[PDB]
């Protein structure tokens, strides 16, 4: 479902519905969302 990044590893963690937020190689309880799939356009001015 949703993939987060272990704030220490950066490893992809597939947390599910109502599961403790923890890193499975790094036990870290802080993870980050991943960059959206939407199109990102910036003008260079």
């Amino acid at each position: 479902t949703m993939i987060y990044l272990c704030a220490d590893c950066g490893a992809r963690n597939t947390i599910q519905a109502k599961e403790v937020i923890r890193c499975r190689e790094c036990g870290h309880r802080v993870m980050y969302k991943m960059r959206t799939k939407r199109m990102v356009q910036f003008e260079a001015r």
């Binding site: 220490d8 190689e25 036990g27």
Partner: peptide
């Protein structure tokens, strides 16, 4: 204390 702090910081993954 410095050595103990170093030990605790480096192994935070193992000690977790």
């Amino acid at each position: 204390l410095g050595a103990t702090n170093r030990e605790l910081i480096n192994n935070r993954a193992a000690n977790r």
